Design an enzyme around this catalytic site. Structure first.
Site, PDB file in Angstrom:
ATOM      1  CG  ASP B   7      -2.198   0.775   0.986  1.00 42.88           C
ATOM      2  OD1 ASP B   7      -2.646   1.610   0.414  1.00 42.88           O
ATOM      3  OD2 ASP B   7      -1.755   1.970   2.288  1.00 42.88           O
ATOM      4  CB  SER B   8       0.004   4.374  -0.715  1.00 42.03           C
ATOM      5  OG  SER B   8      -0.917   4.877  -0.442  1.00 42.03           O
ATOM      6  CB  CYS B  70      -2.477   1.168  -2.942  1.00 39.57           C
ATOM      7  SG  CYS B  70      -2.704   2.684  -3.984  1.00 39.57           S
ATOM      8  CD  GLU B 150      -3.012   9.086   5.355  1.00 39.25           C
ATOM      9  OE1 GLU B 150      -1.642   9.673   5.798  1.00 39.25           O
ATOM     10  OE2 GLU B 150      -2.782   8.170   4.644  1.00 39.25           O
ATOM     11  CB  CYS B 181     -10.568   5.049  -1.608  1.00 38.50           C
ATOM     12  SG  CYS B 181      -9.409   6.422  -1.312  1.00 38.50           S
ATOM     13  CG  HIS B 183      -7.178   6.662   3.410  1.00 39.02           C
ATOM     14  ND1 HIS B 183      -6.408   5.495   2.679  1.00 39.02           N
ATOM     15  CD2 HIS B 183      -6.788   7.235   3.951  1.00 39.02           C
ATOM     16  CE1 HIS B 183      -5.075   5.873   3.214  1.00 39.02           C
ATOM     17  NE2 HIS B 183      -5.292   7.257   3.618  1.00 39.02           N
TER      18      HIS B 183
HETATM   19  N1  LIG Z   1      -3.933   3.900  -0.417  1.00 32.27           N
HETATM   20  C1  LIG Z   1      -4.634   5.093  -1.714  1.00 32.27           C
HETATM   21  C2  LIG Z   1      -4.971   6.386  -0.763  1.00 32.27           C
HETATM   22  C3  LIG Z   1      -4.244   7.009  -0.425  1.00 32.27           C
HETATM   23  C4  LIG Z   1      -2.758   7.507  -1.368  1.00 32.27           C
HETATM   24  O1  LIG Z   1      -3.226   8.288  -2.105  1.00 32.27           O
HETATM   25  O2  LIG Z   1      -1.531   7.175  -1.779  1.00 32.27           O
HETATM   26  C5  LIG Z   1      -5.647   4.114  -2.539  1.00 32.27           C
HETATM   27  O3  LIG Z   1      -6.650   3.196  -2.434  1.00 32.27           O
HETATM   28  O4  LIG Z   1      -6.599   4.720  -3.593  1.00 32.27           O
END
Ligand SMILES: N[C@H](CCC(=O)O)C(=O)O
Ligand SMILES: N[C@H](CCC(=O)O)C(=O)O
Lengths: 249, 247
Positions: B7-8, B70, B150, B181, B183
């Site tokens: 993940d990011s 992600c 966040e 997404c 989040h």
């Molecule tokens: N993890 C990213 C959200 C945060 C990012 O942009 O890195 C997603 O699921 O799109």
């Protein structure tokens, strides 16, 4: 001269605008690490490594002086960077303190420092201010202002609700507010408006702009047309597109 | 069964949580690129490169299955990764579509896709949905939801005003909302309440949880020691996990 302007992304354009406004240099090499942005939410170690790496980017360009336009970088990585450079590296924090000292005589004036969490947590503004004799210093990490400004939310209820979110917990009524972040100047009037209203102020607090401060400082230190070259870590054309809106005549 | 979850940053924990629960794995190597997060606001080229470099991280840990938690990476770099990959790579998009076919028969039901600018911009969800027959599709890059979450703005007028900022322009009243997404699961309750309280809807729209969706899919293909890693301070990242995984 020919200089380099460094920043985490497009925020640095607020500095570049002041630089262009002043016509201080013939060549400017703008570089934005748009692929890793933002720095403000990251840790100290990381930002320091980003700082070093930024130097590496300018090695071939051979600039006489590097301007670290990013407040977050100026706060946590300017020292280490200067520690491995042959050329002078000027951050934006130092010039702002000179700007404050030059126009705020009352050592008791309430000063509020705004910036990213990294910037604030480093306490770089507070230390430099205390050292200069100021006794009423407050600070606030207004993180969300950055993504908001990047989505171009520069007015309306969302911004007002966001400003209200960060400002309400405020004890002091500032006479000086430091825009210790590249983004905040795009909402400077909105911030002035907020305090003027919520505190029935006759005049708006004095706002310290990082770009304007660095310029004055650079004219001072180096008793001083404008051709910029953009470079980015992320899509550079995407970055160049932003310059158009930010630098807006 | 040893797998790596990518993940990011810390948003991927929402998928991790759905994973851990199912317990169908005995080892998970979580790697969040916290130093370069977010991916959602960046360009395809950069995101593809980032995803490629993510593989260079699980070579040593020798995992059998790689889960790209992600949504943005899934949307922009899954193909590229799977290409140069030896092991199978499952993202969070396709599984969410299978879960949708499975739970939505009305090929005309209003479907709203929520994700980062990059995810929405790639049309990954709209395309996959269309190849399955759906005709009532709408998308919204609800960018600010990420930085708000966040920063833990999961309730209050700031969150409420942000939802209003993004939703008010909404033309069609969604029956299905995709949390495209990592989040968004954290404000699912709040998102349901928005439309519910805003239109007097007795029942809340259907929300598709990417994490659950990949689980159902992983259940069919049928395949815990969690190990946290990060490109940024690993301390700051794992700390976060405590809250996301928190139950
Ligand atoms: N993890 C990213 C959200 C945060 C990012 O942009 O890195 C997603 O699921 O799109
Ligand atoms: N350039 C940063 C703001 C954006 C970021 O967090 O990278 C600063 O001036 O603090």
């Amino acid at each position: 001269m020919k200089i380099g302007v460094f920043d985490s992304g497009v925020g640095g354009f607020s500095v570049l605008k002041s630089l262009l406004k002043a016509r201080l240099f013939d060549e400017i090499i703008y570089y934005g690490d748009s692929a890793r942005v933002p720095y403000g939410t990251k840790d100290p170690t990381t930002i320091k490594q980003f700082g070093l790496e930024a130097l590496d980017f300018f090695k071939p360009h051979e600039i006489e002086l590097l301007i670290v336009a990013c407040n977050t970088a100026s706060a946590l990585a300017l020292e280490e960077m200067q520690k491995y450079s042959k050329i002078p590296i000027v951050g934006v924090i130092e010039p702002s303190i000179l700007a404050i000292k030059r126009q705020v005589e009352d050592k008791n004036a309430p000063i509020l420092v705004l910036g990213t969490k990294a910037t604030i947590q480093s306490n770089a503004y507070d230390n430099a201010l205390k050292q200069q004799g100021y006794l009423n210093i407050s600070h606030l990490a207004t993180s969300l202002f950055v993504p908001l400004i990047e989505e171009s939310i520069l007015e309306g209820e969302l911004l007002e609700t966001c400003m209200h979110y960060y400002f309400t917990p405020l004890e002091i009524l500032p006479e000086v507010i430091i825009l210790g972040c590249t983004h905040f100047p795009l909402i400077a009037q909105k911030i002035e408006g907020y305090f003027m209203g919520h505190f029935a102020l006759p005049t708006p607090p004095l706002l310290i702009h990082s770009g304007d401060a660095i310029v004055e400082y650079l004219q001072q230190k180096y008793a001083l047309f404008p051709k910029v070259e953009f470079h980015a870590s992320g899509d550079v054309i995407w970055l160049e597109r932003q310059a158009k809106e930010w630098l807006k005549l």
